[PDB]
Amino acid sequence: VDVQQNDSATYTNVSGNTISEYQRSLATSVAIEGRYNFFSGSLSTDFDSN
Amino acid sequence: TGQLSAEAKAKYGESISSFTQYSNTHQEVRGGDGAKAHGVFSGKKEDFQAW
């Protein structure tokens, strides 16, 4: 048997990192008024989406 | 004599973020003995000296 010295080392390192972020906002508002000498009217509407 | 008020409002927002990181490393050692040779991958001088 023929034995040869072969003292050796190898190293490898691979890493990946990722972040993804998405954001949305929506706002809506409506205000209405109505007037008559013997009547008053008001309406409001509000909407929010995230 | 009549009174009316009307209002409309809208707001919109969008935001996007992205991050990416990538690393690669490759080390190789020859000679000495393999067990001490693995020690140099610590990057620590005494282990490099031991190799």
Author numbering:
A (entry chain F): 82 to 131
B (entry chain E): 233 to 283
Kindly provide excerpts from the paper associated with this entry:
Mpf2Ba1 is a 53.2 kDa protein isolated from Pseudomonas monteilii through a multi-step purification process informed by artificial diet bioactivity screening against WCR larvae. The protein is comprised of two domains—an N-terminal MACPF domain and a C-terminal β-prism domain. Pore-forming proteins (PFPs) are a major class of soluble proteins that oligomerize into rings and undergo large irreversible conformational changes to become transmembrane assemblies and breach the membrane of target cells. We have identified and characterized the non-Bt insecticidal protein Mpf2Ba1, providing mechanistic details for how it effectively kills the devastating maize pest WCR by forming pores in midgut membranes targeting a different binding site than the insecticidal proteins currently deployed in commercial transgenic maize hybrids.
We were able to convert Mpf2Ba1 pre-pores into pores by either introducing lipids, in the form of POPC and 4% cholesterol mixed liposomes, or by raising the incubation temperature between ~50–53 °C without adding lipids. Although heating is not the physiological trigger, it appears to catalyze the refolding of the α-helical TMHs into β-hairpins to form a β-barrel, which has higher thermal stability than the helical conformation, confirming that pre-pore-to-pore conversion is endothermic. The 2D classes of the pore showed a distribution of stoichiometries, ranging from 21- to 24-fold, demonstrating heterogeneity of oligomerization. It was also evident that Mpf2Ba1 pores dimerized tail-to-tail: the barrel of one pore was inserted inside the other, and the inner and outer pore had different stoichiometries (3D classes in red and blue). Despite the most common stoichiometry in the 2D classes being a 22-mer, the inner ring of each dimer showed a consistent 21-fold symmetry and a clear structure, while the outer ring was a mixture of 22-fold and higher symmetries. Therefore, we decided to refine the 3D structure of the inner 21-mer pore, which was determined at 2.6 Å resolution and revealed a pore with an outer diameter of 240 Å, β-barrel diameter of 135 Å, and a height of 120 Å, increased by 40 Å from the pre-pore conformation. In the pore conformation, the β-sheet at the MACPF core straightens by an average dihedral angle of 36° to allow the helical bundles to refold into membrane-spanning β-hairpins and collectively form a β-barrel. The straightening of the MACPF central β-sheet repositions the HTH, which is pushed ~8 Å towards the lumen of the pore, restricting the diameter locally from 135 to 110 Å. This shift brings the HTH in close lateral contact with residues of the neighboring subunit, where Phe273 contacts Tyr92 on β1-strand in a π-π interaction, and the side-chain nitrogen of His270 forms a H-bond with the oxygen of Gln145 on β2-strand.
